[PDB]
Design a binder for these strands. Sequence first.
RNA 1: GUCUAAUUAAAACAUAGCAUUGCGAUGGUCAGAAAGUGAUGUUGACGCAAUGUGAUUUCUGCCCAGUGCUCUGAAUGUCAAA
RNA 2: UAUAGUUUCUUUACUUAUUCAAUGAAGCGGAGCUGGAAUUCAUUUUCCACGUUCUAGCAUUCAAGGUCCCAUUCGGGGCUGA
Lengths: 251, 121, 233, 68, 56
Amino acid sequence: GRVIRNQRKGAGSIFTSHTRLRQGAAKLRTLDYAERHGYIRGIVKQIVHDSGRGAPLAKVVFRDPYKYRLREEIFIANEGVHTGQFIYAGKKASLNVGNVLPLGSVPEGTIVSNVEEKPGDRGALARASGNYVIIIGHNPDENKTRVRLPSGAKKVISSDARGVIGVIAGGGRVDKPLLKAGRAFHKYRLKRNSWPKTRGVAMNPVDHPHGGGNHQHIGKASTISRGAVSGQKAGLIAARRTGLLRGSQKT
Amino acid sequence: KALKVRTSATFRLPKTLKLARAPKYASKAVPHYNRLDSYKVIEQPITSETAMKKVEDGNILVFQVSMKANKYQIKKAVKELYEVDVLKVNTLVRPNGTKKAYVRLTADYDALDIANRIGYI
Amino acid sequence: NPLTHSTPKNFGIGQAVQPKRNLSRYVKWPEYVRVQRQKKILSIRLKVPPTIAQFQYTLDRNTAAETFKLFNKYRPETAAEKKERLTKEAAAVAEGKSKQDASPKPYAVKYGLNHVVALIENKKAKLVLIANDVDPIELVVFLPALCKKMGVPYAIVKGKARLGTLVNQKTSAVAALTEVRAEDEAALAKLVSTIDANFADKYDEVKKHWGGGILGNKAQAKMDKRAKNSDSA
Amino acid sequence: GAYKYLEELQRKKQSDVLRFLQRVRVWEYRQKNVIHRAARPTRPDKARRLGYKAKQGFVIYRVRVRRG
Amino acid sequence: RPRQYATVSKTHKTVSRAYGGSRCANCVKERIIRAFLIEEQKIVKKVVKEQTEAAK
RNA sequence: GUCUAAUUAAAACAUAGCAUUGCGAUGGUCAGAAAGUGAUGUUGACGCAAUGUGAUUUCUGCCCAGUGCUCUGAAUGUCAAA
RNA sequence: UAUAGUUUCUUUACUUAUUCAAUGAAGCGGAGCUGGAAUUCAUUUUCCACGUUCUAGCAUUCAAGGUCCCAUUCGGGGCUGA
Ligand SMILES: [Mg+2]
Ligand SMILES: [Mg+2]
Ligand SMILES: [Mg+2]
Ligand SMILES: [Mg+2]
Ligand SMILES: [Mg+2]
Ligand SMILES: [Mg+2]
Ligand SMILES: [Mg+2]
Ligand SMILES: [Mg+2]
Ligand SMILES: [Mg+2]
Ligand SMILES: [Mg+2]
Ligand SMILES: [Mg+2]
Ligand SMILES: [Mg+2]
Ligand SMILES: [Mg+2]
Ligand SMILES: [Zn+2]
C-alpha cells in the first residue's frame, strides 16, 4: 500500500510549525542564585498577542546581577497582570498573582500555572488559556509536592520546582463557535498544516485502512492495540472503553 | 604556592607567538612581469564613423581595451602612451566580447589633433 | 578629606551588580584538563587492588634526598666526556698499546628497564629505585615482587623525571646501583637498612590491603552527617 | 627483560589489577575522540611484536568502533 | 530616514533637555519626580528600621 | 467552498458543530540505515495526536454471546533461550 | 534451633561507570561570625534567618571609604570593604 497521512507528518516537511510571528518561547527565568536564595524584581512592559496561541504573553524585564544589562524574559501572562506591574521571582517572594514562587513555599489550595515538572526546565504544566495547577499537599521530608493537573491527574513533583501564581489568561476561548471553515482556516494558518481533515473512510484502501468499500464503513474495529505498528494506528488507539461517556470518570 | 585568580568561568585559547615566514626557498623563482601593461590595456583604436564623430565633436577617443582593464588602468595607460590628461572614462562590453573605452580628454588637448598623430583619422 | 564620602554598595541579591569575584571553581575547563583530573578522581574512588597501591607509599623526602645525593656521585658520562675519553683511548692504543684498559673501570648508575630486570634476575643489583608516575603501570607492577623474590632492596621514589635528571635523560622509570665504591658502600648499607624497613619488610602486609575507596568532600560530609545523626544516644 | 612479564601479564585480563586498569582506561578512551593520536603505545610489548619501533616516523593512533 | 540623520546637525535630532531626543518632556518629568520621591522614601524606610533596631 | 488538467462538478470531498480515543515529557503520534539524529514542539490537556458523524431543531432505543480493544495477576494451566 | 562455609533470588544503600537536563559552567558542600527563638541544670544543646515589596525612576569605569607600602608627581600596588 501507500504511506498514510499520519505516517507522513513525522518527516516534517509541510507539517512543521509556522513560527514567523511568534515572539519567542514562553519560558521562565533561569534559576540562578537569587530565585533560590531570595527574590529578584522585574517589571511587565507589555502584554502582547502570540500567533498560534490563545494565551497572551508578558514581556518582563529583569536586571542581570552580574553585568550591567537588562535581560528581557517572555512569560505567559496570568489573568490580572498588567503593564507596569512588578513581578517578584524567587524563594522569598510574596504570594501574589504573577510571582514565580517555588511550590514548597506556597500553601495548599494555591492556584499556579507554568509549573516546572523538574526544576530548571523553565516552563511546563498549565501553560494554555485558562489552565491552572492546584497544590494539594506537601511531603517536606522527601521534599515533594502533590498537585492536581488540568487533566485530573495527580503528580508528585519537587518542592524546588517553580510556578506562576494565578490562572493563565485567555480563558473562555473555546466557548465561542467559529461558525466558519474560514475561521478554522485562519486558526490553523498560524499553527501548522493539520486542517482540513479528510475522513479515511472516504478514501481508497491504498491510502488508509478504513478506505474502500461500496459503502463507507470501517469494516474492522476502529480500536487499535498499542502494539500495532505505524500504518495500522488509525482509529482509537489503546481504547480502554469506547462510546458515549455515561457518568463519572471514577478517577 | 597559590593559584591564579580568574574572574570569568570561560577559558579562552591563549595568545601564542605567531611566526612569520622566511622559509628556505621561493615559490616560483621568478616574479612574473606585469600581466597587464599599458600596451596590453589599450589594444587598438576604433575607427567607425560613429566613433570618429565623437573625436571631432566631443574630444573623445574610442579605444578597444582588454576585458581585464578597468578605468584606472585605462586612464593611466592613456596618460603614459599618449602624454595626455584624461577627464573621464566610460566603458562598455560589446556584443562581440571586447571592451570599448570612451576616453574624454581635457579642454587643453585635442583628440582630433592626437588621433592623426596616433595615425588614424 | 571633606570631599570624599563613603558610598558603600549593597551587594545583596537584588541590588548592586556583583563585583569581579574569583570564579576559579566554576571554570569551563578544557577536556584534557577534565580528563586528567577526573582520572585521578576515578583511580581512588575505585577499590584499588594491592599490586597497585604497592605504590602510593613513596620514599620520604629526607632519605630520598640522601639516596639521590648518593646516586648523583655515580652518574653516567656525557657525550663530551665520553668523546675525550675515547680520544685518550685512541691515543693510548697507538702510544702505550694498552688492551683498551687505559681508561679506568667506571662506577655508574644502571638504568634501563630491560637491563635492570636482568640485573635483578642475576642478583647483580644492590639497590633499585622505581618510579611511581609510570603511565602504563604494568611496566613496573611486577618489579617489587621480583626484587622481593630475588632478594634485592627496592624503593618506590617520586619522579621518573628526577631519575632522568639523575641519568642525563628526561625519564628513566627505574634506576639501579649494582657496584659501588668503597668510599660509599657504608652509606649504601645505612640506606638499604632504612629502605628495606619501609618497602621490602612491609611487602607481605601491603600485598593484602586494597587501596582507594576514598570519597569526595560533598559525599564524605554527607556520610559523616548521617553517621553522627545515627550515633546519637 | 620486561617484555616477557608484560606479555604474560596482559594475558591475565580477568585478574583484579587488569580489570581495574581496563575499567579506568575504557573511561579515559571514551572521553577522548573516536580517533585520536596516542603519544606512546599502551602495550609496547605487543606493538614491537607487531613491528613498532620507538624511532621517528612510527605513529600510534587509538580508535574506537561501534560494536555489533 | 535613518541614514539621512547622519547628514544633518545635532540640533535637528535633539532638544536641549535631558533625554532630549529619546524621551518625552512629560515622561522626563515623571521619572524626575519618581526618582526624588522614591529616594526620599528610601531614607524614610531606613530611619524607621534604624529606630526599631535601637528600640529592640 | 473543493475535486477527476484532456468524456463524470454531483447527492461525492471539505466545513462549522457533535462525540469518542491516546498522552502529564524517562510521555502520546510519526520519521530515520544509524546517530551526541529528528517533526509535532518558539508546544503542555481551552494542548497535541488519531478516528468517526456532519449546520440548526428534535432525538440518538435493546444486545458485550462473536470478532476486536482494554483491565486485572496469589495460580496442580501452557510457555523460549540462558 | 545456632553456626563457621558454599550458593541462588528479593529489599535497601553508595557513587565512580552509564543516562537525563541546564548554564556565557557564578555563588555548591562543610564550618564559622552576627541577630532571633531557645532550655540551659554548667557551659552550652541545638533550630531558624545571616542587607532588596506603596511607586512603569536610577543602579556600569579593578568601588568609594578604611589601612599598609612605594618614593611623590602626573601618582602605582596590596589587604579589607565582600
Ligand atoms: Mg491543508
Ligand atoms: Mg472515492
Ligand atoms: Mg491496507
Ligand atoms: Mg472500508
Ligand atoms: Mg465511493
Ligand atoms: Mg557600465
Ligand atoms: Mg531640535
Ligand atoms: Mg474530466
Ligand atoms: Mg465537465
Ligand atoms: Mg459528506
Ligand atoms: Mg517526543
Ligand atoms: Mg528451556
Ligand atoms: Mg551552572
Ligand atoms: Zn512621552
